[PDB]
Design a protein around this ligand. Structure first.
Ligand code: CDP
Ligand code: CDP
Ligand code: MG
Lengths: 226, 227
């Protein structure tokens, strides 16, 4: 076995996907082999595709997925809209265990938040993390309300003994503002803030994104993940 | 005593204050005596005042506050900015217990979400509900992400044996889109949906607000909140 992290967020559009790519890119430049798994992808009608973002931004090639639904809804609703079911629990857990190998960092990106339905029936990214014995990296905002949502996600993780590998602020504004600066300090009091990615990093070309990513995390911590 | 209800939300700006006003209004129209309590109010230098707004909307006059901070931040950050302290846990409980009375519905409006720190050290509204043996009414959105946020809040309540008095969709769009209608159907499988308040209800005058409020809640449920 290697290291499996689920990358979850406190909500939708907090930057989980940019974080997966950024940590992927930071680990790759540390000589770590990276694989990213997005079991369920929604919003394909408008072109959503988080694995292709990670491939473009970070250059991961081991990019694995099981289902893609057209509508920009939560997985369960997008599936009912399409008239089809979510994939089964065993599919996603086994896909991830099969990605896992010594010396490799495997990131599992969910859909929205920790407790959204990912597989039939009612199984979540938390259930999946329990099954593969993964730790969780939690992507937060620096905006108003983040302390509550972070604490809630962290309590839900710990309730099922899913270790917290730290926080990442998905989007750090420029200029910060009084709320973001206050929240960042307050976030660090409840868990390790591993990085804060600058707002707009997802528009960067691959070379600029690698530079940002290498600077954004601590070199020792990334190397220490595997 | 009577019935104490904390009114919390899955976030800030989900409609806690309008819900408080609407439930207060429906209970008042059922002949129930109502008090609305706001132990920690932030953003007062921007004009933020939920007690005053509950009074504007539903006519409530039994309105109790405790801490007020000028800056629109989390209570802990607003207090630091002002060089003031958060209230103690027992000061909040005293504020609520002074209001509690047989035959009375006392509503305690949180600040932001359920785990916002209201007192030191890290004392939250969940702790307060334990102290005054109140159930929690959870105000949610109908938008993307509400299911995760509602389930996270409900787990947090169960972890401390704080009963969930049900859900209220704070703002309900007319017409509802696909995502909103899906979320609503799914929220009703998670817990009782007590009401879904029409969007923009804060622009209804006293009469239209009161009518909206009587229709929004099941009369049996409201009447059953306090005997
Ligand atoms: N540091 C960041 C984080 C996100 N973003 C963008 O803001 C949107 C939300 O990010 P995301 O797609 O990773 O959100 P999740 O739903 O994956 O959590 C996306 O369109 C990002 O491209 C950015 O430009 N700079
Ligand atoms: N059904 C509703 C819900 C909220 N609103 C308004 O939407 C804003 C947020 O509602 P709120 O202040 O009660 O939200 P909280 O921060 O108290 O949870 C406020 O401006 C309300 O006046 C409305 O007009 N009709
Ligand atoms: Mg309010």
């Amino acid at each position: 076995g290697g290291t499996i992290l689920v990358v979850t967020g406190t909500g939708t559009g907090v930057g989980k996907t940019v974080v997966c790519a950024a940590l992927a890119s930071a680990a790759r430049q540390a000589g770590i082999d990276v694989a990213v798994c997005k079991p369920v992808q929604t919003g394909t009608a408008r072109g959503d595709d988080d694995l292709a973002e990670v491939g473009r931004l970070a250059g991961v090639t081991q990019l694995a997925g099981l289902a893609r639904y057209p509508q920009p809804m939560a997985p369960a609703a997008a599936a009912e809209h399409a008239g089809m079911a979510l994939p089964a629990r065993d599919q996603i857990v086994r896909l991830i265990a099969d990605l896992d190998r010594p010396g490799r960092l495997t990131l599992v990106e969910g859909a929205g938040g920790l407790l959204v339905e990912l597989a039939e029936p009612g199984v979540t990214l938390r259930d999946v993390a329990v099954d593969v014995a993964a730790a969780a990296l939690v992507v937060v905002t620096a905006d108003l309300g983040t302390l509550n949502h972070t604490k809630l996600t962290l309590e839900a993780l710990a309730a099922q003994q899913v270790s917290c590998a730290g926080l990442v602020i998905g989007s750090w504004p420029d200029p910060p503002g009084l709320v973001a600066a206050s929240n960042r300090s307050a976030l660090a009091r409840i868990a390790m803030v591993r990085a804060a990615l600058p707002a707009g990093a997802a528009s960067l070309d691959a070379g600029d994104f690698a530079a940002m990513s290498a600077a954004a995390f601590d070199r020792n911590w990334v190397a220490g993940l595997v």
